[PDB]
Design a binder for these strands. Sequence first.
DNA 1: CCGACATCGCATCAGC
DNA 2: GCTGATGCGA
DNA 3: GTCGG
Length: 327
Amino acid sequence: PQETLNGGITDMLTELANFEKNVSQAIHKYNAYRKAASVIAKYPHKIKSGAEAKKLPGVGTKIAEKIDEFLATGKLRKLEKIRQDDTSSSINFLTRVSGIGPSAARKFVDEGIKTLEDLRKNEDKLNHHQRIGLKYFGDFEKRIPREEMLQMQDIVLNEVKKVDSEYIATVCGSFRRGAESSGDMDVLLTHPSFTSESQPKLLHQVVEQLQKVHFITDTLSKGETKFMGVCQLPSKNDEKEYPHRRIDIRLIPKDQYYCGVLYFTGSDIFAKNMRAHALEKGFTINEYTIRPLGVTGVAGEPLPVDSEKDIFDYIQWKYREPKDRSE
DNA sequence: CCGACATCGCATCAGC
DNA sequence: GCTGATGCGA
DNA sequence: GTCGG
Ligand SMILES: Nc1nc2c(ncn2[C@H]2C[C@H](O)[C@@H](COP(=O)(O)NP(=O)(O)OP(=O)(O)O)O2)c(=O)[nH]1
Ligand SMILES: [Mg+2]
Ligand code: NA
Ligand code: NA
């Protein structure tokens, strides 16, 4: 359903969601406002009344009243006032710097740091992550066209195989689902010599090669299974510079790899469907394993998985291509 | 009435 | 110094 | 904030 259908309401709702998360630190109300925004964004009718909205799962009494106020007046008094509040609106904004969450934003605004200029004057008060996110504030909100993602996949798959031809790397995320643009790049990495029961240099070596061919330009965090960093395509001769992009690489054991691929392919809207669909068959699936429930409820040992397809066979579900997986 | 509401790796903090 | 708690992104 | 035990 198009935006102009209920876009007024979902924008209200997402705005209320962010103020809950970033200012009031009410994460559950943040998820509430998003559950309603999402169920409403899919509702294929221009909502005429808050009561009409309340029929949808996740829209309850208090949101329904906000939809009334918005429909009568075109605005929400509480949101207008908060949008004009210097403190709250500053707190809310600085959380757009990756590395600054609600807690650090509030503490910056407490001491009167309120803008990117204020963050630039006070670099010594930022951690490493925050400086990188500050450095790339703009770049990080630009989206990645599939053409650039493909070029990025070319570099990643090539340099991984060049380190060790026995690595398997899959670029997951929306990209894997045909998405015409992406928000970041999500790489899963596995290797024969890495299993549930079993060097720590396996991930570090892949990061090192991508840093050495100047693909990876900064490191947000790094450990033995999860990498969070920044990358950029080489510049096309005299032509312009690409944006720096968010890239994550994570190392998964061989026998947990396809559970990971499915998990980190998403969408979450599809993913939680398929673990509750799916719970009926007496199976539970986290990112790692699939296991059987369980006649009072005891999960058994994890069942072998050798393809993304297998986890569809256990559930007696039709295999779904990544491309048909937005829900 | 009143609690659940994804879950996890990693960086940094509080506390010992 | 080490462990555990907390913030953070996703 | 919403849902539901
Ligand atoms: N949002 C979210 N996704 C999760 C989570 N846990 C696992 N996933 C899964 C579901 C996600 O689909 C998958 C990829 O991670 P992203 O980069 O966060 N989402 P995508 O790449 O699809 O969209 P975009 O192009 O804008 O980056 O990981 C979680 O806690 N939150
Ligand atoms: Mg992605
Ligand atoms: Na309802
Ligand atoms: Na942030």
